[PDB]
Amino acid sequence: ARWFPKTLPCDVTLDVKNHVIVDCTDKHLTEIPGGIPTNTTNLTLTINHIPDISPASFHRLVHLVEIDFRCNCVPIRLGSKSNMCPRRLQIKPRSFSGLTYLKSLYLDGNQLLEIPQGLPPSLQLLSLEANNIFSIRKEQLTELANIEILYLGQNCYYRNPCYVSYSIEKDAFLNLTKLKVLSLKDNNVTTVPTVLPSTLTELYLYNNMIAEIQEDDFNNLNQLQILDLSGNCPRCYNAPFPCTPCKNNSPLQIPVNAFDALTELKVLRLHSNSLQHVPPRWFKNINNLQELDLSQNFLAKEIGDAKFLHFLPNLIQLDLSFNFELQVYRASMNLSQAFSSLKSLKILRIRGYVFKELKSFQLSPLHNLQNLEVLDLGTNFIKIANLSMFKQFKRLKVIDLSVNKISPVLEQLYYFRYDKYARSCSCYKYGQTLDLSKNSIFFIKSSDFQHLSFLKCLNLSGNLISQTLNGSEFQPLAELRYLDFSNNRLDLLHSTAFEELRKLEVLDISSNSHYFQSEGITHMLNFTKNLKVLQKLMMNDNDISSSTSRTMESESLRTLEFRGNHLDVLWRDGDNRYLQLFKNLLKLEELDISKNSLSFLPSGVFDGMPPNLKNLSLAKNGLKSFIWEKLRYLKNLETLDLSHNQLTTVPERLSNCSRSLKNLILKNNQIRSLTKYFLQDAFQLRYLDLSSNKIQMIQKTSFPENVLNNLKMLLLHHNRFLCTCDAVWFVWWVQHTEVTIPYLATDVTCVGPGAHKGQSVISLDLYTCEL
Amino acid sequence: ARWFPKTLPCDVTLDVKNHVIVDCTDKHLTEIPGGIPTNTTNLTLTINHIPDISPASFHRLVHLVEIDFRCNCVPIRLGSKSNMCPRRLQIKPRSFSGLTYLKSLYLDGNQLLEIPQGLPPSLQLLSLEANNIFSIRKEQLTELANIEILYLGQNCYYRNPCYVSYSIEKDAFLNLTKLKVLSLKDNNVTTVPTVLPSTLTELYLYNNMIAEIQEDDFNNLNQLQILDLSGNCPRCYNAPFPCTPCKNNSPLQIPVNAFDALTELKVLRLHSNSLQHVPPRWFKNINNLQELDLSQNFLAKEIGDAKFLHFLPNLIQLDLSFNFELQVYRASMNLSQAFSSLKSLKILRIRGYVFKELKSFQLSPLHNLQNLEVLDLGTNFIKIANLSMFKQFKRLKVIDLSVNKISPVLEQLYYFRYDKYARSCSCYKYGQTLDLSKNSIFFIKSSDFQHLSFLKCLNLSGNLISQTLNGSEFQPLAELRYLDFSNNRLDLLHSTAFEELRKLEVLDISSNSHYFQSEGITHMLNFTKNLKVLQKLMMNDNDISSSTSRTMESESLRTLEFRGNHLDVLWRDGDNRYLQLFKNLLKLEELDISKNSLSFLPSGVFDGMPPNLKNLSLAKNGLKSFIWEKLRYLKNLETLDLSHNQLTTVPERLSNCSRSLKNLILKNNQIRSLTKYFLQDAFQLRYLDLSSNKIQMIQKTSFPENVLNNLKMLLLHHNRFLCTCDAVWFVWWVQHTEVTIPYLATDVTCVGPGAHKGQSVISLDLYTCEL
Ligand SMILES: *[C@@H]1O[C@H](CO)[C@@H](O[C@@H]2O[C@H](CO)[C@@H](O)[C@H](O)[C@H]2NC(C)=O)[C@H](O)[C@H]1NC(C)=O
Ligand SMILES: *[C@@H]1O[C@H](CO)[C@@H](O[C@@H]2O[C@H](CO)[C@@H](O)[C@H](O)[C@H]2NC(C)=O)[C@H](O)[C@H]1NC(C)=O
Ligand SMILES: COCCOc1nc(N)c2[nH]c(=O)n(Cc3ccccc3)c2n1
Ligand SMILES: COCCOc1nc(N)c2[nH]c(=O)n(Cc3ccccc3)c2n1
Ligand SMILES: *[C@@H]1O[C@H](CO)[C@@H](O)[C@H](O)[C@H]1NC(C)=O
Ligand SMILES: *[C@@H]1O[C@H](CO)[C@@H](O)[C@H](O)[C@H]1NC(C)=O
Ligand SMILES: *[C@@H]1O[C@H](CO)[C@@H](O)[C@H](O)[C@H]1NC(C)=O
Ligand SMILES: *[C@@H]1O[C@H](CO)[C@@H](O)[C@H](O)[C@H]1NC(C)=O
Ligand SMILES: *[C@@H]1O[C@H](CO)[C@@H](O)[C@H](O)[C@H]1NC(C)=O
Ligand SMILES: *[C@@H]1O[C@H](CO)[C@@H](O)[C@H](O)[C@H]1NC(C)=O
Ligand SMILES: *[C@@H]1O[C@H](CO)[C@@H](O)[C@H](O)[C@H]1NC(C)=O
Ligand SMILES: *[C@@H]1O[C@H](CO)[C@@H](O)[C@H](O)[C@H]1NC(C)=O
Ligand SMILES: *[C@@H]1O[C@H](CO)[C@@H](O)[C@H](O)[C@H]1NC(C)=O
Ligand SMILES: *[C@@H]1O[C@H](CO)[C@@H](O)[C@H](O)[C@H]1NC(C)=O
Numbered sequence A, B: 001a002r003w004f005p006k007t008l009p010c011d012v013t014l015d016v017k018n019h020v021i022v023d024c025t026d027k028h029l030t031e032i033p034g035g036i037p038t039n040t041t042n043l044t045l046t047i048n049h050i051p052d053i054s055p056a057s058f059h060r061l062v063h064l065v066e067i068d069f070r071c072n073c074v075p076i077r078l079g080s081k082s083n084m085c086p087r088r089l090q091i092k093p094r095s096f097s098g099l100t101y102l103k104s105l106y107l108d109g110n111q112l113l114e115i116p117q118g119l120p121p122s123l124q125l126l127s128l129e130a131n132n133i134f135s136i137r138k139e140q141l142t143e144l145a146n147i148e149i150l151y152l153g154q155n156c157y158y159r160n161p162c163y164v165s166y167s168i169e170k171d172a173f174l175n176l177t178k179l180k181v182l183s184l185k186d187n188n189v190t191t192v193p194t195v196l197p198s199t200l201t202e203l204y205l206y207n208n209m210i211a212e213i214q215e216d217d218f219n220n221l222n223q224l225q226i227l228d229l230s231g232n233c234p235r236c237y238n239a240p241f242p243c244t245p246c247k248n249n250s251p252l253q254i255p256v257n258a259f260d261a262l263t264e265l266k267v268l269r270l271h272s273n274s275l276q277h278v279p280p281r282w283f284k285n286i287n288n289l290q291e292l293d294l295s296q297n298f299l300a301k302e303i304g305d306a307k308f309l310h311f312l313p314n315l316i317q318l319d320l321s322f323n324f325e326l327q328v329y330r331a332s333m334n335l336s337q338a339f340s341s342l343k344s345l346k347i348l349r350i351r352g353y354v355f356k357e358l359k360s361f362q363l364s365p366l367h368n369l370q371n372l373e374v375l376d377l378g379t380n381f382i383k384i385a386n387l388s389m390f391k392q393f394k395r396l397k398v399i400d401l402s403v404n405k406i407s408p409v410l411e412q413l414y415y416f417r418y419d420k421y422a423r424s425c426s427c428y429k430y431g432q433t434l435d436l437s438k439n440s441i442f443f444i445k446s447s448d449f450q451h452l453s454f455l456k457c458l459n460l461s462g463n464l465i466s467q468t469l470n471g472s473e474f475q476p477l478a479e480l481r482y483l484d485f486s487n488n489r490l491d492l493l494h495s496t497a498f499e500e501l502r503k504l505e506v507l508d509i510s511s512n513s514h515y516f517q518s519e520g521i522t523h524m525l526n527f528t529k530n531l532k533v534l535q536k537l538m539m540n541d542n543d544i545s546s547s548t549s550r551t552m553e554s555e556s557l558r559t560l561e562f563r564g565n566h567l568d569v570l571w572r573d574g575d576n577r578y579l580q581l582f583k584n585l586l587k588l589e590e591l592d593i594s595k596n597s598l599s600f601l602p603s604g605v606f607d608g609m610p611p612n613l614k615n616l617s618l619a620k621n622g623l624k625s626f627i628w629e630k631l632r633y634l635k636n637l638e639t640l641d642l643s644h645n646q647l648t649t650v651p652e653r654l655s656n657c658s659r660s661l662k663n664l665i666l667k668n669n670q671i672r673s674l675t676k677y678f679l680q681d682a683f684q685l686r687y688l689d690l691s692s693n694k695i696q697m698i699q700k701t702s703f704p705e706n707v708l709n710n711l712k713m714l715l716l717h718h719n720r721f722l723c724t725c726d727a728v729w730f731v732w733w734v735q736h737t738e739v740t741i742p743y744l745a746t747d748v749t750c751v752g753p754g755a756h757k758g759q760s761v762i763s764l765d766l767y768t769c770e771l
Helices: A138-144 A307-311 A337-341 A360-366 A387-393 A525-530 A628-633 A725-736 B138-144 B307-311 B337-341 B360-366 B387-393 B525-530 B628-633 B725-736
Strands: A011-015 A019-023 A042-044 A066-068 A104-106 A125-127 A149-151 A181-183 A202-204 A226-228 A267-269 A291-293 A317-319 A347-349 A374-376 A398-400 A433-435 A457-459 A482-484 A506-508 A536-538 A559-561 A590-592 A615-617 A639-641 A663-665 A687-689 A713-715 A750-752 B011-015 B019-023 B042-044 B066-068 B104-106 B125-127 B149-151 B181-183 B202-204 B226-228 B267-269 B291-293 B317-319 B347-349 B374-376 B398-400 B433-435 B457-459 B482-484 B506-508 B536-538 B559-561 B590-592 B615-617 B639-641 B663-665 B687-689 B713-715 B750-752
Touching: A307 A337, A337 A360, A360 A387, B307 B337, B337 B360, B360 B387
Parallel strands: A019 A042, A042 A066, A066 A104, A104 A125, A125 A149, A149 A181, A181 A202, A202 A226, A226 A267, A267 A291, A291 A317, A317 A347, A347 A374, A374 A398, A398 A433, A433 A457, A457 A482, A482 A506, A506 A536, A536 A559, A559 A590, A590 A615, A615 A639, A639 A663, A663 A687, A687 A713, B019 B042, B042 B066, B066 B104, B104 B125, B125 B149, B149 B181, B181 B202, B202 B226, B226 B267, B267 B291, B291 B317, B317 B347, B347 B374, B374 B398, B398 B433, B433 B457, B457 B482, B482 B506, B506 B536, B536 B559, B559 B590, B590 B615, B615 B639, B639 B663, B663 B687, B687 B713
Antiparallel strands: A011 A019, B011 B019
């Protein structure tokens, strides 16, 4: 099909407008490759080991609007220790001055000592994060007259130390009259640099050594929308990065008038500034403020008073998390009445207040916040809460009591990571959610959920629930669509478990292995019959090796996850009793029986499958053999996942095994060669992964072109390809096909013979085979 | 050193007396190898694919006392499905008649249709388990006149069906006048064969279809010591193998006088015979009975009466497990007073009686059993037990309440596997043990252990204990030496946790990841300081990535297991705070820090190790690099485990890195070659494992003979050895060395060049390299 093989080790993409995008991310390059198109608008060379840039680098590439050249020499402590960068990136004079249309230049993570000079006046975005530039001088910024976005952070901090204070000359940035975004985070800065251009919308000064704000510091910044001063005078208790507090337990000192000019301010972040008081006067001339982060201060007392809230009627989010007093376990949470001023508030987070008992009235300041959607009281060591108090919170989307000690999306390292916005080189959608995960609930009964019939998802994941559910425990939860009961100890003595949840669409009972791990106890896996609208059942990692019921039954269920169990034991060769375990799941479309130690599949398994099975996984089973002909029984099979097993062969004729099969995943097996007519007449096939096997040769008979050319994708990487004259067809076909084959640059490689060892097949000249 | 290389693919061992033991177990043989020594006494050829035996097989081997030729054609359902046996083993005439001294012949698992004829009269043991011989005729046993031990079981059952009843001619075995042991288990037998020779000591008739015992079936068996009739009329409820009960819920019917002749009987197994009553009259003329198994019957009621116990004053073990009535949850356990007649009883097991509440007086029948050592009341769904009742059981070695629902060694498939004696092809030693594992204990306090100060080991593994231990919870356990607290939710707010256990030698807090998995909670890992005689601490799989204490301290601790945590995060490059975490464990000799995602080791780690570290594991870390010179800091290092990582190199000179190092494990890495002088002057080295790497060449310089010849073991298997003329030394050395190198038969193999591919280096003739 293709007249000229793409030999360039980079992905190439058009988009008309008006971009030619060349992506060489992580291609182990030591040089900018030759042959990059002349029309290239966006060139990405991130994560390679290109030791320099010169006028030759970009000579022909005059239409470049963006160079992303990040992490070609990452600082020692941030980067790989197996392949350390020997010496800082070298940038020779006039390497960029030619690039008349260059709007964006990323040079992060290259150990640069200075702001590269000779940059073109078209430049809008310059990024220099994670270099060794720790002294900014007005003279070096004159080239940046038209610059709008300037990232200078992470040049002086514990992962990349400069061993001195950061220095910024007086008025360094003032004459940058178009600068909108300035980031000087993670830099050992000691004072807000001044005067700043008034054109700024976003100023990031967090994680620095600024002990005081002068009353003038933000005087002219009347366009500023985001200000972040977090992590100056940090709260260091249980900090999981090195942490130096301001001396004398001092807070970051901010004059009461410091923010007066900031009338456009939308976001103010004062996380981890050791604040003991939040003076109302701060917010006098800011009315448009939407997001305020006061997490990680010492505001426990202030939470009970908080007069400043009366000045914040447009505030959408408020974070007061991790303000607890050291060594104190409060009896209760004292929320000021001032919380009732927050007419616009959608999200309130008060993790880590740390208190024993939550009572209904303590939340009364929140009762009339009409727009409140999220109340997050996680990680509080709450021991006692009458859950019925949430009858007054039907309007909320999420009530998060996660990680508490109750008994009758944000990343998991969010509040405690160093820089949550550092650049590297779920049942909420069902409706109202009560997250009780990771608590101490050992016993449940109906009245625990009294007045909570509005709930659509309940998360009980990671409690201690160890009882014989009989259908009486959740009786009030008449609307519940999702129940996450994972990480408990479900005891399925009774097949009536869960049947009171009459609207239940999704049930997770994964990781309830405790009672399935024990011998000669009853287990009623036919409990599914009673749940008439159940769509998805997850029963992963339960170690299930025995069952009292021979069959699971459902008229509704579409997806069953049954991974990490012992069907190998249930289907012990010679025992027929459980071969139809899934057969009466009549609408079942997706079955995951990966990680079940199925070395082999007894005969009967495929006949036993329910008639509409579409997506079957047998991954990670140690399968050593597989009667491919038995796929004939699975008349609606579309996706078959046999990844990570020990198969040594493919079928003689795939078309003779299944007429429906579209996606066949055979990665990570022991396949040494393909059968002579493997894919012959397999017209349905659209996706074939044969990566990470031990294949030497592929001949045309096995891979007919009328089948290959309808493939959306064909994965061949990490095999043992022998590039002799017998491979002439494969090598040609690979070089000239339209079919998408990932990693042709990286990992489609001859292992021999000698001459061609280690070489990419895409680059292979086999002219000697046609003399 | 050796003049003639051992080329035979079998392990060969002398023992003077007077045995030449040739072991070819699992060597993928399709033929009996040539060159087996003529003096061979014991030849084992188990698990190979040798399709026949003939007079050539053993022609020269006239001193053979034993042939173990098991599983060269295992029945379809018991054996491998990837390599099924095509056709039953063929035994030609007169293959054994020469073997005049043959005392033992195992031919199990070969699909034999008949009892091999022409066997020598010296034969004492014949084993034919898992063949297809399901009709025994007196005529075929005339060859076995001197036989003592005859195993005929597993020839007709669900894993290897014959589709008919087993047949034994009248008096078939009678004229075998030396037969001591007869096993006809798992055979679809319908009646006790008669008459049996009176010389029998052991008779195994379990797992069969015998509905009745005739009163004379065991009349003449006055030497019989073991009788097993289990699994005839089985109790089939929650059976995890296919199970057909006798009709009408009938028991195995046994006349009251059936055992009268059995005066020597020591062991009687009546497991899973659906017995409702145990008539005293059975035991009238058996006084020497030591072991009785009555598990898996319907003896719940009978346990409360049990008059038969008065006839059993010499009984050592009694098993009454899994006698519960279906659908009944008794309030209490009713043990007859008759239990007090059991003067000799050491072991009593009553698992699966199934009851709610255990009370002190219910065990009073056991109060004066002076020899009682084990009381096992596991798997009973006990909800309530005042543990102080065990103040009356100081003399016991083990009190097992494992797998219950309390809240104030036997294999895990023991009671419910088909044939617990089927042949395939711990803190008890500290003193008194109370096993509370896998219960529902959510909260502990001191009084829970009142009157239990005698305890040496307590197993709390797998409870729900989720509290902030402060040193008050275990105060009475003044003698406790071992605490298994694994699989709980330890909350280490307080460094005083566990300090009341003043005699504690071993603490397991593994798999208490719950509170270490959460961010910005306190964790006092310095709790170790208070435990003055603590020798071993296990804190595996806790996911530990943060710690409030910088250092762990102990004057006593010798062994710390810290595997499955996140030291990679604690030692994040640039953070120095935790680099001395283990340093003040002054007597630490063994440290396991495998599975900690340590891609690299930051500098400081080895300087941070405590000074007497001997045994270090860094296995399974994905280590991509390792500064070998840093081993100089570990001045007492003896064993270093770097298995399962990604190391590509060894040190230039191992001796220059450590003077103390004796055992170096480098298996499962990516090592492609050895340094020129790798082991030069490494005089301390005794064990080197380089198996499963990618090594092509080993030269003499790297492996000097003065170092090699002090090695206890040297592992080289599963590498990528190239057998060219450059390998001449290695191939010679390997063939001629005394040094133990396992798997020379199986997996020390040339990968090339072409000519020698797949060939063992032991067998390699490289004469062309000296032509
Ligand atoms: C932040 O700047 C301070 C100086 O303000 C650096 O601290 C100096 O570091 C050297 C070498 O570690 C010491 O000998 C000096 O005495 C230090 N001075 C002070 C005042 O502490 C600090 O290392 C810088 N931080 C980073 C991460 O580079
Ligand atoms: C044990 O013997 C019984 C009969 O004594 C076998 O059962 C017969 O099996 C055949 C073929 O399956 C059937 O046609 C008959 O219905 C069965 N007869 C009866 C009376 O049940 C049984 O197959 C044998 N078991 C094994 C495991 O070999
Ligand atoms: C030892 O086996 C006893 C019967 O099986 C079995 N399996 C469970 N999962 C139970 N949970 C459980 O509580 N019991 C006890 C029980 C027994 C009968 C009636 C009511 C409660 C259980 N018994
Ligand atoms: C969220 O920040 C909590 C501070 O740390 C922290 N860590 C634990 N592991 C506790 N267990 C625990 O019960 N608490 C609450 C507490 C706090 C102070 C005094 C006594 C009890 C815990 N608090
Ligand atoms: C190309 O560069 C422009 C300007 O920097 C940018 O807006 C656009 O999103 C880029 N496209 C990419 C990386 O695909
Ligand atoms: C429930 O909470 C757990 C544990 O915190 C989390 O993994 C899971 O995503 C939640 N489940 C759902 C369905 O939201
Ligand atoms: C479920 O299990 C078995 C039948 O397989 C039976 O004992 C029980 O009554 C059944 N109950 C339901 C709801 O299917
Ligand atoms: C050798 O055979 C004899 C007779 O069967 C037996 O007693 C002995 O255990 C055997 N020795 C070994 C090591 O297998
Ligand atoms: C215990 O068991 C028997 C039933 O076999 C009954 O007769 C006896 O009286 C019971 N005793 C007590 C104290 O429960
Ligand atoms: C437990 O029994 C003991 C008698 O050994 C007694 O001291 C104690 O009061 C009982 N405890 C409870 C909680 O019933
Ligand atoms: C405690 O019990 C568990 C079984 O529940 C077992 O794995 C462990 O070995 C026991 N602990 C000790 C120290 O024997
Ligand atoms: C330890 O906890 C117990 C009970 O929770 C309490 O009696 C005691 O005061 C605690 N010890 C200390 C020093 O707080
Ligand atoms: C553990 O560390 C804390 C400070 O981090 C200290 O208060 C405490 O006493 C230490 N405990 C021991 C037992 O050394
Ligand atoms: C390593 O070898 C060099 C050269 O013999 C020597 O100077 C140095 O002391 C040696 N170090 C150790 C730890 O043996």
